[PDB]
């Protein structure tokens, strides 16, 4: 992980060589591709026995040439929930080697997750997703159009993973991030990649394909398209990326890869906002399905954190450490970007889900949960500054056991408070004047969605993550039990 990446990238030339070497290291080997193709052959053969004339299409991370080690194997089955169950049972029962089979109809794109034992692979089986095929082939096409695309995407992907800006949650999907990189490359003054409109209008004869009413047509080879007039190197394009996405207006702009342009949400959105297009903190238009915002799942927190981390990364890219190499210095160039973010930062990033309740009642409830039941000293969306001189998050089992033992030999809130107090007195201390808290933090609740965002202030012993997990479990319990009274 950090050993391989650091020792391999620190020894190579400049930033560009680092990016390319990173691509070389993280891309799938020949054996891995062989394994994948063989399993796909298994799937295809069995499904051909049961569904004559059906085609299993590998898509996603496999064919977009952004593939990484241990990536998912995504399969589109070309032949509603009941049919999904049928496919799942066929997987489970027939094709050899698959064991974990779990149906997920609930997603926007219903899929059957499966796990193949002998190859140790895993993936999704989608009954209908045809857009994934064509836009993945579009991605691979982009990687064919210019050679800087793949290094940029690999680097920025690993970076976003490190920063916790990408994920299966409210975070940006890898597809969304890739589309962001491509869009960035389309908007350069010497454009790196042609717009999707240009690819469709150029295209070629016999390449017409329409999926769900959207035109998926693009050239199948990069040879017929003229190269880029952009002479910019990798490092410059990286810094320019960070700067660009940090300086952009995300809420007021729908980024179109089709048009290669930022269209204002302010009523600069033609065709009456193509029906089914969700607007929000980040608006990124799919190059093919225009009614689909690939970033529609991205919340305000994630977008803001994106722009912040991109601003900090852009500031780093202007530094000397990034530009010039280092001899035996382990951290130079690409490496600090690829270095993962602090677990404290990562946890302050992820919010804490709270039960349904009126905002006012919920906030009052929370400050009650911090005031008593926890040793917190609190003071004034809603936000509170809390301080702790004791470890509240640990030892509560022994404490409540002790109290119940004193109950043996001799509703909510205050009882837990007793626990906290008896954690405090026997024995964390008597506290003290002059204070200087053990752990101090900030609790914030937004009106919608209602989620607690806990960020650390003073954490000398670095025990904040313990507190964060503790709160993750405890605060919903607190609110729930307070509701039960």
Author numbering: 145 to 223, 337 to 637, 763 to 792, 802 to 876
Direct quotes from the study:
After transcription, the 3′-end is oligo-uridylylated by a terminal uridylyltransferase, TUT1 (TUTase6)910, one of the members of the non-canonical nucleotidyltransferases. TUT1 is composed of N-terminal Zn-finger, RRM, palm, fingers and KA-1 domains. The C-terminal region of TUT1 is a previously unidentified RNA-binding domain, and it was named the KA-1 domain. Thus, the present structural and biochemical studies have demonstrated that TUT1 acts as a U6 snRNA-specific terminal uridylyltransferase.
Therefore, the amino-terminal putative zinc finger (ZF) and RNA recognition motif (RRM) (amino-acid residues 1–140), the predicted disordered proline-rich region (PRR: amino-acid residues 235–304) and the carboxy-terminal region (amino-acid residues 651–750) neighbouring the nuclear localization signal (NLS) were removed. The truncated TUT1 (TUT1_ΔN) was overexpressed in Escherichia coli, purified and crystallized. The form-III crystal belongs to the space group P43212, and its structure was also determined and refined to an R factor of 21.4% (Rfree of 25.8%), using reflections up to 3.4 Å resolution. The form-III TUT1_ΔN adopts a closed conformation, as compared with the form-I TUT1_ΔN. A comparison between the form-I and -III TUT1_ΔN structures highlights the mobility of the KA-1 domain. The KA-1 domain rotates by ∼40° with respect to the catalytic core domains, using α14 as the axis of rotation. The N-terminal RRM is mobile relative to the catalytic core domains, and the C-terminal domain KA-1 domain rotates relative to the catalytic core domains.
